[PDB]
Design a protein around this ligand. Structure first.
Ligand SMILES: [Ca+2]
Ligand SMILES: [Ca+2]
Length: 501
């Protein structure tokens, strides 16, 4: 064995994994068929993802990891082009053959700003963290085979001698070569069936300039300074600026549009589909009158997958290699950072005890598979809620209340870790949560609300129920559970901009 761990993929997941393991005394080799710099989506940070980066940073004493959670710290240390800003998620609803209303908006603001991650710069910086801590990296390589033996792993490489390790982590995405060879991936049982078209653009107009100013919308935050979701019956489109930070230099804006394949299947080239969308929804088109595409569109016809298992004696698939649902709500980054946080202490224990058995990693699998399942219910039910603004308004409080509870839970874990310095206590506290992979992590009342609300939405889809009935059923569920949630007034449906505290 020339290494302790081989990591496939040098993106943020592989890089952070490599950094924390190398920091902790393991000899790590990161392999990637691609090379930096390169484009990637997965751009909208969340409260959870920020807390998870800070937890990773504190758990392994790597300060630079925490920089990646704060836009001001990204600008200062990674570079001024490396992010935009977000003060929350905003949602504007539209329908075909009718004018769009600036009152069909919800936007619950954050207290602390978060980042729109320009992944080419963020990921390259992350790899630099790993390299500076002693992880080895080989870019632009070709893996010829991966052998999983009872005494380790052996990876054959084109035009080089094979490399050996005790353990292999797949930190790649849809191209997970372990996933392909292990036969663990499937689309069976997934409620979400969606496609995605995405690119980066110049000269994308702000929501306030294109559609309605703050004096009209009454939003507490500029939608320009938010992850903006334009939602409609068959899909949604994101507007994620990198050019909205007063000290930023990036000129681009990320644009992605997604369809529920059960309701609309695209047939034509990405630019033609984009123009058809804008004709259908002229309000959305107001962003793009002077816009130009700065890259080729990428089209993915089906973005959803899960896995039946993701750990063995000698391997672990990180979340992107295991399952993905949708960009909606940006749950992928969350699941990724939490999975690293759960896995890394176990890999260290394994390497120190020289014991490599599947059962040691079972809670990593339990978290990841539960997270993908929860993500599938969240997103599938959301796409059904896209049918009507009032329904969306009621529905978004189910997501928000859960996310707020999970964020608060992670914030508390971080506080305890910062002051106690007690890594083992933290690891055990995260593992002891009652609902790993669920939005609240540990609230039986919230998970009751989530389960029952998803049942309402699936039944509404299945039986084509009237949207007013569904919205009301959700509202009554929120009222029933509200006493056991954060005291934000989630049942006050007329307040479309739910504030913290
Ligand atoms: Ca070693
Ligand atoms: Ca994503």
């Amino acid at each position: 064995n020339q290494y302790d761990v081989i990591i496939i993929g040098s993106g943020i997941a592989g890089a952070l994994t490599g950094a924390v393991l190398a920091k902790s005394g393991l000899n790590v080799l990161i392999l990637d068929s691609a090379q930096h710099p390169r484009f990637s989506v997965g751009e909208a940070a969340t409260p959870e993802s920020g807390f998870l980066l800070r937890l990773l940073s504190k758990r392994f004493d790597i300060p630079e990891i925490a920089y990646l959670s704060h836009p001001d710290k990204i600008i200062q240390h990674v570079g001024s082009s490396a992010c935009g800003i977000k003060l929350g998620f905003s949602f504007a609803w539209h329908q075909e053959n009718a004018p769009s209303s600036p009152d069909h908006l919800v936007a619950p603001p954050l207290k602390v700003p978060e980042a729109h991650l320009f992944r080419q710069d963020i990921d390259y910086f992350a790899l630099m963290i790993a390299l500076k801590h002693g992880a080895e990296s080989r870019q632009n390589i070709k893996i010829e085979s991966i052998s999983l033996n009872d005494d380790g792993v052996e990876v054959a490489l084109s035009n080089a001698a094979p490399v050996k390790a005790a353990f292999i982590i797949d930190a790649a995405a849809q191209g997970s070569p372990l996933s392909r060879q292990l036969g663990l991936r499937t689309t069976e049982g997934l409620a979400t069936d969606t496609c995605s078209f995405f690119t980066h653009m110049l000269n994308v107009k702000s929501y306030e300039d294109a559609l309605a100013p703050l004096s009209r919308t009454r939003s507490p935050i500029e939608l320009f300074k938010s992850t903006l979701h334009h939602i409609f019956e068959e899909g949604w489109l994101w507007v994620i600026p990198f050019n909205n930070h007063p000290q930023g230099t990036n000129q681009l804006c990320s644009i992605g549009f997604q369809f529920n394949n059960a309701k609309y299947r695209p047939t034509e080239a990405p630019e033609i589909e984009f123009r058809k969308l804008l004709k259908k929804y002229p309000a959305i088109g107001e962003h793009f009158k002077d816009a130009v595409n700065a890259r080729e569109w990428i089209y993915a016809p089906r973005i959803n997958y899960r896995s039946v298992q993701n750990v063995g004696d000698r391997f672990c698939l990180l979340p992107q290699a295991t399952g993905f649902i949708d960009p909606l709500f940006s749950r992928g980054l969350i699941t990724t950072f939490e999975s690293i946080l759960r896995l890394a202490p176990k890999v260290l224990d394994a390497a120190r005890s020289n014991r490599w058995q599947r059962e040691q990693f079972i809670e990593v699998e339990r978290h990841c598979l539960n997270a993908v399942a929860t993500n599938d219910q969240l997103v599938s039910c959301s796409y059904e809620a896209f049918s009507d603004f009032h329904l969306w308004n009621v529905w978004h409080r189910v997501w928000l209340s859960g996310s707020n509870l999970g964020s608060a839970f992670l914030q508390k874990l971080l506080h305890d870790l910062e002051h106690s310095g007690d890594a083992r206590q933290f690891d055990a506290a995260l593992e002891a949560v009652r609902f790993p992979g669920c939005l609240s992590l540990d609230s039986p009342a919230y998970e009751s609300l989530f389960r029952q609300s998803c049942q309402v939405m699936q039944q509404a889809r299945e039986q084509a129920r009237p949207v007013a009935e569904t919205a009301n059923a959700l509202h009554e569920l929120i009222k029933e559970h509200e006493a056991e949630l954060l005291p934000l007034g989630y049942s006050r449906i007329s307040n479309r901009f739910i504030l913290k505290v």
